[PDB]
Amino acid sequence: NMAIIKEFMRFKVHMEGSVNGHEFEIEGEGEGRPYEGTQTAKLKVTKGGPLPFAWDILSPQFSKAYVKHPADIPDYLKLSFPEGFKWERVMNFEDGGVVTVTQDSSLQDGEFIYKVKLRGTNFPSDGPVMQKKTMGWVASSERMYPEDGALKGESKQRLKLKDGGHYDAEFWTTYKAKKPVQLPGAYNVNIKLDITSHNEDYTIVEQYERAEGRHSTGG
């Protein structure tokens, strides 16, 4: 896969979804350095905008092939190409909001192709997601482990809020390659996800993410 997954790779992403019944679509394009763990994405809301909820609940869904791994941790999701992988995610927020997400990743004509479906439900009409009071995710760590022939990841996540407080969530994701490839043992993936620019109504957004696998739990 050293020649399938190049040191510089682009991707295209399509998301369709709904949040508290508001339907929307997003199209975007991104690029990054899969072995250095860095990537940027430029997203455009193409249906349903301006969105009546916080961009932040969407931002984690736009790319696991771009995680830097040490040589002694098998890079299962890079190894899955060119066929690729699928993932399924549950995000439970502390005020009862829920987002469930499914995603398919493939490689076509030398670019990654991502297709995302998202359903957000049960967010309080008063809460920070529907009132657009969130201000980005704090840096986080996803604990990974193999189970039942797939790679699972779990994390505790936290959104900063305009009022200086925080809004917490738990994330559970299952990642499954489309062909048997080697699973890793347990390890941690440290992630930093930033919104680097956006227009006034978040119908045009750019993101940057850095992700790296480690054995260490330090900081």
Swiss-Prot record:
Annotated protein name in UniProt: Red fluorescent protein drFP583
Keyword Zinc: no
Any single Pfam family the record assigns to this protein: GFP
Self-association state and partner proteins as the record states: Homotetramer.
UniProt xrefs under SUPFAM superfamilies: GFP-like
Role of this protein: Thought to play a role in photoprotection of the coral's resident symbiont microalgae's photosystems from photoinhibition caused by high light levels found near the surface of coral reefs. In deeper water, the fluorescence may be to convert blue light into longer wavelengths more suitable for use in photosynthesis by the microalgal symbionts.
Post-translational note: Contains a chromophore consisting of modified amino acid residues. The chromophore is formed by autocatalytic backbone condensation between Xaa-N and Gly-(N+2), oxidation of Tyr-(N+1) to didehydrotyrosine, and formation of a double bond to the alpha-amino nitrogen of residue Xaa-N. Maturation of the chromophore requires nothing other than molecular oxygen.
Gene Ontology BP terms: bioluminescence; generation of precursor metabolites and energy
Uses in biotechnology: Fluorescent proteins have become a useful and ubiquitous tool for making chimeric proteins, where they function as a fluorescent protein tag. Typically they tolerate N- and C-terminal fusion to a broad variety of proteins. They have been expressed in most known cell types and are used as a noninvasive fluorescent marker in living cells and organisms. They enable a wide range of applications where they have functioned as a cell lineage tracer, reporter of gene expression, or as a measure of protein-protein interactions.
Family: Belongs to the GFP family.
InterPro entries, per the entry: GFP, GFP-related, Green_fluorescent_prot
Keywords from the named record: Chromophore, Luminescence, Photoprotein
